[PDB]
Amino acid sequence: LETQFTCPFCNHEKSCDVKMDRARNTGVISCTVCLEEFQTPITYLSEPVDVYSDWIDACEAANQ
């Protein structure tokens, strides 16, 4: 499972970094290029793929 992801907003490969703040149960995914940021709740079973998942889902939901 890759940790760096293509940004849904600027389509820059591996430009998204994921930070797991487990102490606060929050994952923050940020694109280095276009500076888009997204915050989602996470669990101890969560992974950066799950945070990027929640980001893609939030984008598609907001774009309806």
């Binding site: 907003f9 600027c10 389509n11 276009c34 500076l35 774009n63």
Partner: protein, 365 residues
Amino acid sequence: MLGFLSARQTGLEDPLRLRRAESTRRVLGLELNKDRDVERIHGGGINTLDIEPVEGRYMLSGGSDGVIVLYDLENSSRQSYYTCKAVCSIGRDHPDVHRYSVETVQWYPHDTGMFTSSSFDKTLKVWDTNTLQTADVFNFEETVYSHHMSPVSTKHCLVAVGTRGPKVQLCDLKSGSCSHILQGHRQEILAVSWSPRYDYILATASADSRVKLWDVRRASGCLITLDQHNGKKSQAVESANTAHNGKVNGLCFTSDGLHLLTVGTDNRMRLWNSSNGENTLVNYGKVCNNSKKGLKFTVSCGCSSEFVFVPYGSTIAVYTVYSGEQITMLKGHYKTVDCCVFQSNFQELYSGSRDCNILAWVPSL
């Protein structure tokens, strides 16, 4: 100021004096707008703004969510408080919406019936403003960081595009020829800007810490390479003659086009003689920027002294171009400011930032 009015009435001073002095005074009194608001439609940060060059009424805004919003800035209501309503919108439901962030949007000069928008989806789309449909699309092999149409060209209608490729593309809007490229950079071309003075002069700033001026008619590469030291540290041109000690992510010709303001990721802005690229050694102090993409900043027009409005963190730093003296910080944004566009008719400013807000700064009183 009653002295100014009296001098204008009595012919002591040219009306030019009152006009430019009052423009400068208005710019100095720039403050968060007391009675004005801008409609919020972008779901993501606004990366770019552009007020149309003719009549200065309509404003384009490209968001990080790929939508393009067209606002009317005129207060068509009778109240002193109004919101800049959104006339049109390339929203998520438009068949031609950009799939990724719109990074530059520009009105067609000489006419408001067309505009252009480049995105990180590797497309420069040319839109008919009336039908709001894509009149043309130019696809690129690599993401677009910036683009610019000449604000002066009555003859050519080239769009200079800077992508992550090391080549500056020149897309002819006259019969579509995107094959023309300029060689000489080595990394992503983060900013491009046509000279407002000279028709065929284009300045390009790239991540290789170099700024090059090209005569696009010419067959022999760039005209000038900007050098910080002008020759104090002189070396055979392979890696020397850098404009900055980092990525040069913003360009802006001054109003007359005789100087060039370059902002780079070394936390420095520099002013260059646009005719021979000599550094004028204007200080400006430290200009905080760490943007990994192009940084959009503008200069004032029609004032006694020229000003430059640079995004500075979550603020707008206003500097005097030719002295470097720091005027002020416009402080009303909650995240880093991506773009600021200057309305020259009324000395107004519109700033878009990552907080999904377009804030209007108006002169006080």
